[PDB]
């Protein structure tokens, strides 16, 4: 299992948010921590992605693009997995120091997004997703959202995404298999609408932020103002398996 060997080897370790749990929850503190966590995870997505099989086949501009477009979906998927594996979906395990109960879901002003993410967490258990299926599905997620007008070297992308689909098929093969691929691609598709709702909520925050003084940190301000509106305006869209 060469491919799985590699994905296990490069999988990033635990990441903390730096949140102060000794203080009562407030929207401002929760958002600062999500911003911090978000940036810390992005660093690890970059390290991870550059070490993926084939990733350097991509034009460097496309390498950079695909990470920024798919980072929120990658974080959603992984957070769902941690929630399932660490606490049986009873809460959302953003980080060991940032665990959301329903009161935090509410205080974050992202209650609906949180509920949908808790549902995603429960599906890992209903579907009995294996840790090896998780790793293959997460890698495929990186190659699941791109500009409608194409990437700089579309052909290299196409062949890379193909290989990751072949490798998910591989560990499903290794019929029932048909049913399995359906269930897993349905779950993957469901990540994208959730990421979009996170993007919409945060884009709106950023715009109003001069009165709400949400001091958006530099990396986040750049990605929310430069890259996220491409997704919100439809110029960048997920690659769905099934029709929505």
């Amino acid at each position: 299992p060469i491919f799985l060997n590699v994905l296990e080897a490069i999988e990033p370790g635990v990441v903390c948010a730096g949140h102060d749990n000794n203080q009562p929850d407030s929207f401002a503190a929760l958002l600062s921590s999500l911003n911090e966590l978000g940036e810390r995870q992005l660093v690890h997505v970059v390290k991870w992605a550059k070490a993926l099989p084939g990733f350097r086949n991509l034009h460097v501009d496309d390498q950079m693009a695909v990470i920024q477009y798919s980072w929120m979906g990658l974080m959603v998927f992984a957070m769902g997995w941690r929630s399932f594996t660490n606490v049986n979906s009873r809460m959302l395990y953003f980080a060991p120091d940032l665990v959301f109960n329903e009161y935090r879901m509410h205080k974050s002003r992202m209650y609906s997004q949180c509920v949908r993410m808790r549902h995603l967490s429960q599906e890992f258990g209903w579907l009995q997703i294996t840790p090896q299926e998780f790793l293959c599905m997460k890698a495929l997620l990186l190659f699941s959202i791109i500009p409608v007008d194409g990437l700089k070297n579309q052909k290299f992308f196409d062949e890379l995404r193909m290989n990751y689909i072949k490798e998910l098929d591989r560990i499903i093969a290794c019929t029932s298999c048909s049913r399995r691929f359906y269930q897993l691609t349905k779950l993957l598709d469901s990540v994208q609408p959730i990421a979009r709702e996170l993007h919409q909520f945060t884009f709106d925050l950023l715009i109003k932020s001069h009165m709400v003084s949400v001091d958006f940190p530099e990396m986040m301000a750049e990605i929310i103002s430069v890259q996220v509106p491409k997704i919100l305006s439809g110029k960048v869209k997920p690659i769905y398996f099934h029709t929505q």
């Binding site: 992005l42 970059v46 550059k50 950079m64 920024q68 990396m219 750049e222 990605i223």
Partner: peptide
């Protein structure tokens, strides 16, 4: 940009 700096800083 910030993201490009970060991407380029990773081996």
């Amino acid at each position: 940009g910030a993201f490009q700096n970060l991407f380029q800083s990773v081996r």
